[PDB]
């Protein structure tokens, strides 16, 4: 009819923020990673600003397969920013960003990979995040 409903499988996109490398050791600071996908922001809880920070957090969004297909075609990003948080002054500062896209994410799983932070505040070495991305069921 003139109005047509749509049905497709409900899915979870799960982004795993596993760990970092090549950060400066900063005992006064912590690190938070925030991810935004399609106007929905999720954040890790602060972890120590070690050289190899242990984020160990999954961030999950729900969508259906037809909406996912559209996001692939539009190359809708999952936008990550990494923040150094200074609890002594309740301040934070972006120390770099990563842009992920879903073009390849599938049930058929892919191994996590290292993504360097772009526009990094920490210009010695190459700070990076180990990130996994999967479609769950």
Author numbering: -2 to 134
The authors write:
While the C2A domain of CEP120 interacts with tubulin and promotes microtubule formation (Lin et al., 2013, Sharma et al., 2018), our results suggest that the C2B domain does not directly contribute to this activity, as neither JS nor JATD mutations in C2B abolished the ability of CEP120 to cause centriole overextension when overexpressed in cells. Our structures revealed neither complexed Ca2+ nor potential Ca2+-coordinating top loop residues or cationic β-grooves.
